């Protein structure tokens, strides 16, 4: 049940979601832990606060460290696409 969610932000704000990683074939270390109120992740509202992300901008991140995913989204631009799983 992998639903794909694009997140459009402005240049003044961020996407407004926090990724929590746990530190690997059947492992999903990264998920959503919180959502900043009044953020594009809150307005798009397609993210639940327990969604395990499989990929970021069409790039598998299950075997990717936390810092690399942060750097990936940090350069992603004003739109990012997460492949997620609800919870």
């Amino acid at each position: 049940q992998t639903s794909d969610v694009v997140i459009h932000r402005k240049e003044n704000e961020g996407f407004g979601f926090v990724i929590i990683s746990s530190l690997a074939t059947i492992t999903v270390p990264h998920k959503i832990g919180r959502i900043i109120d009044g953020s594009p992740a809150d307005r798009c509202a397609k993210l639940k606060v327990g969604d395990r992300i499989l990929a970021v901008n069409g790039q598998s991140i299950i075997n990717m460290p936390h810092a690399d995913i942060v750097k990936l989204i940090k350069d992603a631009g004003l739109s990012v696409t997460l492949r997620i799983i609800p919870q």
């Binding site: 961020g14 996407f15 407004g16 979601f17 926090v18 990724i19 929590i20 990683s21 746990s22 530190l23 832990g33 919180r34 900043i36 936390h66 810092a67 942060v70 989204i73 940090k74």
Partner: peptide, 9 residues
Amino acid sequence: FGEERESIL
């Protein structure tokens, strides 16, 4: 825990 990383984006 100590083996976890939270960072907002």
